[PDB]
Design a protein around this ligand. Structure first.
Ligand SMILES: [Cl-]
Ligand SMILES: [Cl-]
Ligand SMILES: [K+]
Length: 164
């Protein structure tokens, strides 16, 4: 298990444009295209991302390509965010993956808003942090996923992803 397998499990793989949990056009492995309600706009963002006129369909390789770029960007975003970096640097590898997972799903801003939970992680109060993370819209709207990520922060193991 690693960040890519982890996020591949949580985001799936779809080769045609689809709407994510929030109703937003996305494709591949959770690659958000736009928050616009316009499919055409999404198609535009897609072609731009791929570098060709796709007609809302991409190949597996292309999806993996955006996914790799997306994971990298997420980590890189973590490293440039003063709110996230210290916490990230304080964590072990497994837990770091959990934080990358959240940032990929909701943006570094979204993540930086978990100030208090983040502080608990830095203090290494695992149980406490986990309780706190659950008090969020994130957990209420995507509870299974959230539970997995929270389990990962609580234990520092991949138990929630093993056998999935
Ligand atoms: Cl892109
Ligand atoms: Cl979920
Ligand atoms: K998805």
């Amino acid at each position: 298990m690693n960040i890519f397998e982890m996020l591949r499990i949580d985001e799936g793989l779809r080769l045609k444009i689809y709407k994510d949990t929030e109703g937003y056009y996305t494709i591949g492995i959770g690659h958000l295209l736009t928050k616009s309600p316009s499919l055409n706009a999404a198609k535009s963002e897609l072609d731009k991302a791929i570098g060709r006129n796709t007609n809302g369909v991409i190949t597996k390789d292309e999806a993996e390509k955006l996914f790799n770029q997306d994971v990298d960007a997420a980590v890189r975003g973590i490293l440039r965010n003063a709110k996230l970096k210290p916490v990230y640097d304080s964590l072990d590898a497994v837990r770091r993956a959990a934080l990358i997972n959240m940032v990929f799903q909701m943006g570094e801003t979204g993540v930086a808003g978990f100030t208090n939970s983040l502080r608990m992680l830095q203090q290494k109060r695992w149980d406490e942090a986990a309780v706190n993370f659950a008090k969020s819209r994130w957990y209420n709207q995507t509870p299974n996923r959230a539970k997995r990520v929270i389990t990962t922060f609580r234990t520092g193991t991949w138990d929630a992803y093993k056998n999935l």
